[model samples]
Target: MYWVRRKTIGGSGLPYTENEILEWRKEGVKRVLVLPEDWEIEESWGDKDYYLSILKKNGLQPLHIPIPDGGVPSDSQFLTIMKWLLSEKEGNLVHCVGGIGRTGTILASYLILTEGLEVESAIDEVRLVRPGAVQTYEQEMFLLRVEGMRKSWLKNIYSN
Candidate 1:
């Protein structure tokens, strides 16, 4: 698996089983962040409880940050996501159905908010690791628009 940087962050498609999660743990994945939730899918992936149980069984913390498929997360939700991503000190895997749009959007935002990368630069960087990430025009535009708002969260956090 191509990494976001060394082993700190990686992105992928949904793992299909408990064993797959185990393998990821061995590879140093300590947390699982998945986009879109019960309102999402079926035949291809198990329900939320199944994912939670298996991830728990394998010792991976599962975080559900649901964005509609191909959609951007709300600004508050996006900042919450930033906090979660920033909190991880070990390997974290962020995934969506194809590990493209939703996953890439979050990753790109994380880069912008924390790493000081420009939106296009973050998008290009993620694509290097997971080709075809940030797949749609909507996803790309969302990244561009959110860049200006990201710093606002920092001010809010301190004000609180």
Candidate 2:
């Protein structure tokens, strides 16, 4: 596991390299949460889908999440991720280019909304495992917002 602490939840920088991509398969990671947009990868590599295709070829399913570089996703989009994570997927590896910004925000959000952690504690939860997580102010604020919006984060599941 990239995060190494949470077996079901791994967080890391883009696992773009061929050698690096195969490790998750061995670790039993079934899903990968990709937070960066196509343009970010395109700026570095000519083909935007190159890394995602690599994951698919290596038996990994990549889910595109948002927002771009340090930007926070809206509540609805964030709920989609939380629901997906809860939908029987295991070994979820959440990644942005740096792994700790966008990735960290989601992880922290999960801690707050599901684990009943306070905002600061949720931020601390991820930073403990992945240092320098939740780096941006807007992302932190987003986490704070999710902290208060915990009802739907849990209620939506039972409503079904």
Candidate 3:
């Protein structure tokens, strides 16, 4: 229901205010992958700059790579996100508006990429910790579709 940690990745919902950001830092989460379109939070969560400032003040650096509520990241975007997620020396928080869908897709892909797990196994790992993850058919399919792409990235990263 709250932030769930799987190895080096932390999955959860977006930190809406300063208090939430502080709370995340208290949990030892300093890096974040934000997966919400800017306009999506305009009215409900207030200004993006203000929210980002709150995160920065709390020592939580967020990488905002906005994606639609029901969308998936492209191959290039996925590679970039994976690189960023893995770049965290301490750990990274992967999040979306509600902490499921897009967040789960990326997290599952991360598992597949790093652990060399199959798609189903990777998804199972994510869902076991973060229940209700990958809530949509498209989101699940996106993971399946990108399995090969993930493998390619792994090959490139490991082969170097």
In lDDT terms, which candidate is top? 2
Candidate 3 or 1, higher TM-score: 1
lDDT of 1 by residue, 14-78 (tens): 76665667778888888888786675634445567777777778888888877878788887777
Report the number of the highest-TM-score candidate. 2
- Provide the overall lDDT of each model, using Cα atoms, as 2-decimal numbers: 0.76, 0.78, 0.75
For residue 108, give model 3's deviation from the true position in Å. 0.6
TM-score of candidate 2 against the unseen true structure: 0.89
Model 2 Cα lDDT, one tens digit per residue, 4-69: 345678788875467777887787787888888888776655565777787889888877875788
User: What is the descending TM-score order?
Assistant: 2, 1, 3
Clashes in each model (backbone N, CA, C under 3 Å)?
A: 0, 0, 0
Better model by lDDT, 1 or 3? 1
Off by over 4 Å in 1: 39-41, 157-160
